Amino acid sequence: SNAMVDKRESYTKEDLEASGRGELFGAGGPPLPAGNMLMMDRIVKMIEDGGSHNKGYVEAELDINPDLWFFGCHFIGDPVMPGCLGLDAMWQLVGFYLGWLGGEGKGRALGVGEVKFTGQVLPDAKKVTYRINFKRVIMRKLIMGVADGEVLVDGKVIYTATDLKVGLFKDTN
Amino acid sequence: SNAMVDKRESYTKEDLEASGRGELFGAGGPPLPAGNMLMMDRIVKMIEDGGSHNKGYVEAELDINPDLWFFGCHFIGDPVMPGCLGLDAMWQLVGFYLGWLGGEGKGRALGVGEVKFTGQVLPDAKKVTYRINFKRVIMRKLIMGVADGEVLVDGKVIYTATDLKVGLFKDT
Numbered sequence: 001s002n003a004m005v006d007k008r009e010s011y012t013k014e015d016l017e018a019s020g021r022g023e024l025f026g027a028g029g030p031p032l033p034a035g036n037m038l039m040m041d042r043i044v045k046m047i048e049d050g051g052s053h054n055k056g057y058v059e060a061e062l063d064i065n066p067d068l069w070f071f072g073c074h075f076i077g078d079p080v081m082p083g084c085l086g087l088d089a090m091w092q093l094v095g096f097y098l099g100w101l102g103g104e105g106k107g108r109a110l111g112v113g114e115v116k117f118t119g120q121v122l123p124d125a126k127k128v129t130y131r132i133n134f135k136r137v138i139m140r141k142l143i144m145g146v147a148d149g150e151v152l153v154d155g156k157v158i159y160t161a162t163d164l165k166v167g168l169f170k171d172t173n
Numbered sequence: 174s175n176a177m178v179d180k181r182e183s184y185t186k187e188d189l190e191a192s193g194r195g196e197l198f199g200a201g202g203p204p205l206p207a208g209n210m211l212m213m214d215r216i217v218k219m220i221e222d223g224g225s226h227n228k229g230y231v232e233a234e235l236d237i238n239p240d241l242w243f244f245g246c247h248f249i250g251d252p253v254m255p256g257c258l259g260l261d262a263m264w265q266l267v268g269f270y271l272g273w274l275g276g277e278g279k280g281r282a283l284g285v286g287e288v289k290f291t292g293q294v295l296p297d298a299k300k301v302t303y304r305i306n307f308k309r310v311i312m313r314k315l316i317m318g319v320a321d322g323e324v325l326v327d328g329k330v331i332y333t334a335t336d337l338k339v340g341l342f343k344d345t
């Protein structure tokens with residue numbers, strides 16, 4: 001497995017930017033997206049035996065302000081964070097967890113079982129929270145994770161996802 | 174319903190930009206996302222009561238070039254179109270269809286059933302295709318569309334989505 005992981009229980013914005021550049025986990029591990037595709041500012045908790053199935057728990061946050069890039073283009077005259085990007089943040093975190101445990105390769109989302117959106121992130125919000133509860137983690141041969149996740153805005157659940165799936169791949173050609 | 178719709182069977186890039194500005198359907202109708210959230214260059218066909226369930230069909234295309242913004246940040250050194258954006262293109266198209274039929278309000282995705290990604294869009298691809306087969310359209314009281322979708326890259330199916338759901342809301 002990948003020995004180079006700077007493995008800590010929480011990560012700062014600068015850590016997440018380092019991850020985008022491949023530095024946090026090193027050359028063999030999955031980077032987060034960078035820049036406009038990075039959907040978190042911090043990871044507040046990662047616990048290997050945690051969560052609703054004792055298979056892993058991850059919690060992360062995105063600070064909201066009215067000038068985040070997606071508000072101005074989605075939609076003109078009706079700013080709302082794209083639900084697809086909150087879904088992606090959850091996929092991002094599943095792949096990150098696999099790399100955090102030493103999984104080698106680049107991350108690719110494989111899909112999700114069901115997503116329900118019941119509320120929205122508006123420019124007057126302050127905090128988006130992502131919660132990930134792992135249900136299966138395969139760390140041998142073909143590395144893959146399955147988890148349930150929720151997105152909250154200022155403490156209120158607005159999205160649920162069941163059976164988020166992400167794999168790591170040493171070669172994607 | 175909304176009588177202002179410039180209703181045609183296909184739409185150009187300029188039409189989609191007009192939609193982002195609220196012009197194509199007018200004041201009462203759902204705009205598409207603009208700029209970096211617009212995930213299509215053209216709508217090549219819309220068929221009322223068409224498709225696999227005879228409840229509606231939409232097909233759209235996105236031309237691929239290495240300059241598209243998402244390649245450079247997802248991921249550094251390993252470009253791949255985010256699957257979440259291809260999923261969003263499908264939600265975008267469901268809402269657009271509801272507005273095309275005269276539905277009033279702003280679009281919001283409500284969710285999706287099972288989504289499977291089995292391949293990727295790389296920067297040397299030429300064209301992504303989105304195919305939307307509606308299964309139900311509700312145009313009164315609480316406007317909602319439910320559809321299945323497929324995403325192809327250069328003719329190869331790479332994503333499937335079951336039970337995409339989108340609503341229109343006059344007050345959010």
Ligand SMILES: O=C(O)CCCCC(=O)c1ccccc1
Pocket residue numbers: 080081082083084117118119120121264280281282283
């Ligand atoms: O990007 C999207 O289109 C999803 C945005 C959030 C969903 C939403 O605004 C909502 C959904 C159900 C009920 C009320 C609001």
Ligand SMILES: O=C(O)CCCCC(=O)c1ccccc1
Pocket residue numbers: 091107108109110253254255256257290291292293294
């Ligand atoms: O944005 C993502 O994370 C998903 C990208 C598309 C899925 C993909 O690249 C893939 C899926 C299965 C096997 C190989 C590649």
